[PDB]
Amino acid sequence: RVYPVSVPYSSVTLSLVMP
Amino acid sequence: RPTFYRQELNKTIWEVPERYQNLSPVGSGAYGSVCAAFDTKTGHRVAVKKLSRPFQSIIHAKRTYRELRLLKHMKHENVIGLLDVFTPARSLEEFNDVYLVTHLMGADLNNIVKCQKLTDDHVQFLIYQILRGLKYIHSADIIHRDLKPSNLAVNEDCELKILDFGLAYVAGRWYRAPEIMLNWMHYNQTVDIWSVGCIMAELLTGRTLFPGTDHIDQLKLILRLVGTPGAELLKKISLAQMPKMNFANVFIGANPLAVDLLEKMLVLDSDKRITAAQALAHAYFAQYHDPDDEPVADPYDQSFESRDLLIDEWKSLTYDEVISFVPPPL
Ligand SMILES: Nc1nccc(-c2c(-c3ccc(F)cc3)ncn2C2CCNCC2)n1
Numbered sequence: 001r002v003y004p005v006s007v008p009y010s011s012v013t014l015s016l017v018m019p
Numbered sequence: 020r021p022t023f024y025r026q027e028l029n030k031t032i033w034e035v036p037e038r039y040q041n042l043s044p045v046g047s048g049a050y051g052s053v054c055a056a057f058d059t060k061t062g063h064r065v066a067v068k069k070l071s072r073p074f075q076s077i078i079h080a081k082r083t084y085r086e087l088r089l090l091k092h093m094k095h096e097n098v099i100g101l102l103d104v105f106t107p108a109r110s111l112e113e114f115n116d117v118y119l120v121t122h123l124m125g126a127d128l129n130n131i132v133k134c135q136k137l138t139d140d141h142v143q144f145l146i147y148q149i150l151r152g153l154k155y156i157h158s159a160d161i162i163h164r165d166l167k168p169s170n171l172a173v174n175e176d177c178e179l180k181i182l183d184f185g186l187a188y189v190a191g192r193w194y195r196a197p198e199i200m201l202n203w204m205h206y207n208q209t210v211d212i213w214s215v216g217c218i219m220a221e222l223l224t225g226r227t228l229f230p231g232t233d234h235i236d237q238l239k240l241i242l243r244l245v246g247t248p249g250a251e252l253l254k255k256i257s258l259a260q261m262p263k264m265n266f267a268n269v270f271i272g273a274n275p276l277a278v279d280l281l282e283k284m285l286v287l288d289s290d291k292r293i294t295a296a297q298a299l300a301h302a303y304f305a306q307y308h309d310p311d312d313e314p315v316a317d318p319y320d321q322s323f324e325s326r327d328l329l330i331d332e333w334k335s336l337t338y339d340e341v342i343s344f345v346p347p348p349l
Contacts, residue, residue, distance in 0.1 A: 001269075003224045006136030008272035014144050014177035017135060018125040 023107050028054065033069060034107035035118065042067065049183045050082055055123050058102075061349065064123035065102060073117050073337070080333030082186070083117060084323065087340050089161065089185045090119060092319045097152035099172065099182040104344050114338045124172035124180060128218070131173060132225055139274050141177065142222045147307045148179035149215055153295035157208045159316035161185040164206065166214035167194045168221070192234075193217065193227050197241055198289060200234060203256050209292040216284035223273060244269065245287055252288060276303040 021036040029044055029052065039056040046053065051070040058065045073083035090101045103120040128145070131137070137145075149171065156163060163170070163184040172180040196213035198204045220228040229244075231237025239258075246263025266282045267275065280303050283293040293301075299313055323336070 002271055003220070003226065003228070003269055004271040005139070005223045005273050006225050007138050009139050009274040009277075011274075014138075014141055015175060016126070016131050016141070016173060016177055018175055019130045019134060 020109060031069075033067075033118075034116070035067065036105060039065065039067060039120070049086065049186050050079070056120075065120050066123045068119045068121075070117050070119070074115070074330055074334045077330055080330040080337070084333050084337045084340070086186060087117065087119070087337055088323075091340060091344065092159065092316065093156070093184075095152060095155045095314070095316070096178075097148045097180050098155060098184070099180050100347075101344070103346055104341055106338075106341055111335060111338045114334060114341075117337065117341065124174055126173050128168035128171040128173060128179075128222065132168065132222060136225060137222050139223075139277060142219060142277070143303060144177055144307060145171075145173070145179055145222060146215065146219045147299075147304045149181065149218070150212075150295040150298050150304075151313055152179075152181040153211055153215070154299060154313060155316050156181065156184055157211070157295055159319040160321065161319065162206070162208050163187075163211045163214070164199065165191055165195075166211045166218070167191050168218055171218070192231060192237060193229055196289075197238060197287070200237060204289065207289055209289050209294060212284050212292050212295060212298065215295075215298075216281055219277075219284075220270070220281060223270065223277070245285055248287055251290075255288070274303065279303075 021038065023034045023036060025032055025034050026042065028042065033042060035042065038058055038060040040059050042054040042056045044052065045055045045066065048068045051068045053066050053068040056065050056067050070083055072079055074080045087104065093100050099121050101119060101121060105118055106114060106116055108114045153163070161184060163181065165183065165187040167190065169190070170181065170183045172182055192200065194214040194217040196206070196210040199206050199210055217228050229237060229240045231240045242258070242261055244264050247260050266278045270278050270281065280298065280301055284298065286292045300308060300310070
């Protein structure tokens, strides 16, 4: 099986949403 | 000695200094349960863990001494540290319960991936932070050995902290190095890097990489991707002879720089896996890679580990640690 990335790689500060 | 107050939560009583306020349960932690609280001395939200029956069982006294020893030694941005440790007891003769407190983190990576996708920038930074922790932890001769997404605490600002290291069910099987699951050799530190591999791949994709259904299936899924054991291999301790996948072919649409690391971390022979300190310098982390900001821990004494003492001495050893606690610079 192959597993592709959630968001395909593209070739400026990070954050997440809290539950 | 500060004034305490009592209050029952999930049907047990908590005795805490007045400074911690609005205590609220946030789930389970290692050998206890933890509350989010507001610290009226400092203004920060804190997580408070009260450990379960710390000096009941023999393991428990050992398990309780062990955690407090590790938590008093760990001083690192990606490694949970102690803001405070207290007990309601005013001398050793009444010493019975122990509370640990740390900066409150909002989520763990299990909750994150279960509600969002993640960019290569996200996994770049997240993975980066884990191996900075791991470099620090490994450098004190401590192995996590149960590294898994629920052991990684994260903030709204993408900041990550390792917890529950050096303390070691169904979920945890997925991230265990094979030699440990099936007792193949004496485990070295790279056991955690295998878990790191599994986690990074699952952060990229959103799906557990090796969701083995039992001990036997796990290996089958393991060997299905990484290939059969090479030359040595069996010379380090009967099924289909599968070949090793070219990782580029599996993780489609990934940064090729990221898959090269995955390739280096998910190597079957422990001797061949990349190390945390090694993995840090690689180019996927070149954006965050800064050799001048990737520190090592001070030496840490684990002599008590081989020691067989009585629970009352283990209890006195912990109480000694509780008493001697020096809070960090406010
Ligand atoms: N929200 C949060 N923030 C920091 C830590 C914890 C925490 C602790 C822990 C360890 C030491 C300490 F001093 C205080 C708490 N143990 C498990 N967990 C989380 C594990 C994932 N969800 C439940 C709580 N939880």
